[PDB]
Each structure stands twice: as C-alpha cells, then as structure tokens.
From a paper:
The enzyme is essential for the proliferation and pathogenicity of the parasite as well as its ability to overcome the blood–brain barrier of the host. The prodomain interacts with the active site of the protease and keeps it in an autoinhibited state until it has been successfully trafficked to the acidic lysosome lumen.
Here, we present the 2.8 Å crystal structure of the active site C150A mutant of the uncleaved T. brucei rhodesiense cysteine protease pro-rhodesain under acidic conditions. The first 18 amino acids belonging to the prodomain, a short loop between the first two helices (residues 77/78) and residues G124/R125 at the C-terminus of the prodomain, are not resolved. The cleft between these domains harbors the active site triad residues C150 (mutated to alanine in our construct), H287 and N307. While the overall architecture of pro-rhodesain agrees with related proenzymes including human cathepsin L or C. papaya papain, pro-rhodesain displays a unique extended α-helix covering the entire cleft between the L- and R-lobes of the core protease domain. Importantly, this bending of the α-helix enables the guanidino group of R100pro to interact with the side chain of Q144 in the core protease domain. In the pro-rhodesain structure, the S2’ and S1 sites are partially occupied by R100pro and S1’ by the side chain of Y101pro while a glycerol molecule sits in the center of the substrate-binding site. In contrast to the continuous α-helix observed for H3 in pro-rhodesain, the structures of all other available, nontrypanosomal pro-CathL proproteases display a mostly unstructured peptide in the C-terminal end of H3.
Residue numbers in the entry: 38 to 76, 79 to 123, 126 to 348
The structure:
C-alpha cells in the first residue's frame, strides 16, 4: 500500500473523497494483480500512470476506436508497392522522432499518430526536424471526431484536401486538449511546419512495412492496445491481437534480437513504458500492427542532381 501512495505522489493524484480513492486502490490492487498474470513473459509489467483506472473503462475508452477501424477495414485501401531491408533501423537516433507527448484525457491518439508520421517523413525528406500540431487535427478536422476519436487516413485526407497539404508547428498551435476541452478551430496565428502532397496505405505485410519504414521513416500504425495498459518495458510476445483500437507510430525495428521486435512510439508521455515507447515481437502480427499502416508523402524541392 506504500507503492500506491508512491503512485499518487508520482502522478500528483488528488482524489475527490474516500469513495473515489477506495476503488482506485482496489483497482490499483487488481491492476497489479493482473500485471503479474501477463508477467508477454519476456517483458516487464508494473505500475504505470493508469494503474489508477479499471480495465473496463480502458476497454470502454476504445469502444469507439475499435468501431472506426472496423469501419475503415470495410473500405478499400489502396496499397502502394514497396520497391524493396536493414536488419535493424531506429529513427530515434536518426533525429527523425520528436520527444514523446501526452494526449491526456482526450481520445486523440489518431491525431498523434498522424503528426508523428508527418514529422518523420518530413525529416527523412531532408528537412530539419520540427514538432507539429495535433490540436490542428483535433479542432479543425471535420472528418474526424476530436477527443471522440478518428482515423489517421481521415486526417491525411483532411490535411491535403481541406488544408492544402499544410501542417502547423506545435509551437504556433499548442496542444491544449490534454484536459479534454475542445476549443473551436483557429485558422489564424500559426506557422506552417511541413507540407504533404498525398498519403499512401501499406499492404498487410510486416516485411513490406519494414522496408518502407527503413527507406522513408516513421509510419502511422494502429494496434490493439489491450495489452498496453500495465506495460512497463521489454518486448511484447503475446500481445492481445483481436481488435484495432489505437493509433501509434512505428519508429523502427531490430532483427538481430531474440526475439526481434518493432519499436513503437505512443502518445502517453514518457512516464509510461520504455520512456513512452514499446517494443513488440516482429513477424507474428503482434497487436495486429500491420492492419492499418499508412504514411504521408513528402515531395517538394528536387535539386539533388541540379547542384
């Protein structure tokens, strides 16, 4: 019970009354209880920022998400061929990944997946790495549902087809939905951080995805997040893989490991997992990561062989 107080003191949790805290502790107890059930064996599980909440709300927080992906799955995805694969790449070292962020009490992970992907593709184009705005998407993308959820595909389409291929920087358009508030769209007072021309979807092939990632940079993926709750670190190997319900970002992989793994960036700050990051086994479709991979396309200047 000391480690629950440690938890409270670590995340500044100030409960309403005895009753509200009462469950959170029972709930904390059960989350710690379940954490030793999953104890992906070769990964670590423990206390995270949501050991306070129950796995009925968690699974409820995704009910919408699940239903958006299932609806997207029913529609035709145009896959793009991959020209074809280094045993290991990791775009974090290659300055193609920004510090981890926090979606807060907002169902806005779709927006974080999109922004993260865009940032990676923009930097791999050969631009200076630059944080970009999720708020833009959360408040201004009328295809999607802001804190209610959305699809990366919808948002790629909104940027290109309703915002000229333009993405505003985080600095100029700051993330303020952390608290679940949804202010009106603000078109003025922003600086454009990046430009996209289109987006592509990728086939449901992990080998294919890796080659395009290795070649082009971080991609927006969707996973089943059910096994993510109590994760502290390691490589997941029995990820629950039943229903897609969360948008994350694939930043790399490594084949020279036993077993090999994908490197994924999440929108739950850094206090969660491996500094905001999770590793899942590659090549067995863990968390169904291959089902909804997609990537913005960067073009622009082409003076490579002209100077």
């Amino acid at each position: 019970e000391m480690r629950f107080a440690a938890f409270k003191k670590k995340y500044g949790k100030v409960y309403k009354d005895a009753k509200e805290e009462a469950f959170r502790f029972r709930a904390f107890e059960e989350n710690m209880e379940q954490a030793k059930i999953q104890a992906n064996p070769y990964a670590t599980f423990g206390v995270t920022p949501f050991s306070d909440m129950t796995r009925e709300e968690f699974r409820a927080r995704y009910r919408n998400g699940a239903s958006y992906f299932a609806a997207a799955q029913k529609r035709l995805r145009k896959t793009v061929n991959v020209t074809t694969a280094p045993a290991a790449v990791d775009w974090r070292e290659k300055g193609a990944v920004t510090p981890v962020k926090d979606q807060g009490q907002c169902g806005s992970a779709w927006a974080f997946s999109t922004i993260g992907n865009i940032e990676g593709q923009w930097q791999v184009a050969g631009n200076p790495l630059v944080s970009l705005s999720e708020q833009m998407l959360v408040s201004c993308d009328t295809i999607d549902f802001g804190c209610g959820g959305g699809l990366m595909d919808n948002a790629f389409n909104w940027i290109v087809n309703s915002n000229g291929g333009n993405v505003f920087t985080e600095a100029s358009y700051p993330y303020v939905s952390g608290n679940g508030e949804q202010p009106q769209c603000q078109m003025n007072g922003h600086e454009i951080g990046a430009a996209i021309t289109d987006h592509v979807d990728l086939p449901q092939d992990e080998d294919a995805i890796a080659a395009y990632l290795a070649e082009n940079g971080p991609l927006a993926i969707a996973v089943d997040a059910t096994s993510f709750m109590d994760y502290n670190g390691g490589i997941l190997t029995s990820c629950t893989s039943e229903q897609l319900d969360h948008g994350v970002l694939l930043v790399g992989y490594n084949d020279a490991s036993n077993p090999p793994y994908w490197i994924i960036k999440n929108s739950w700050s850094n206090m969660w997992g491996e500094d905001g990051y999770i590793r899942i086994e590659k090549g067995t479709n863990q968390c169904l990561m291959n089902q909804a991979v997609s990537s913005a396309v960067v073009g622009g200047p082409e003076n490579l062989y002209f100077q």
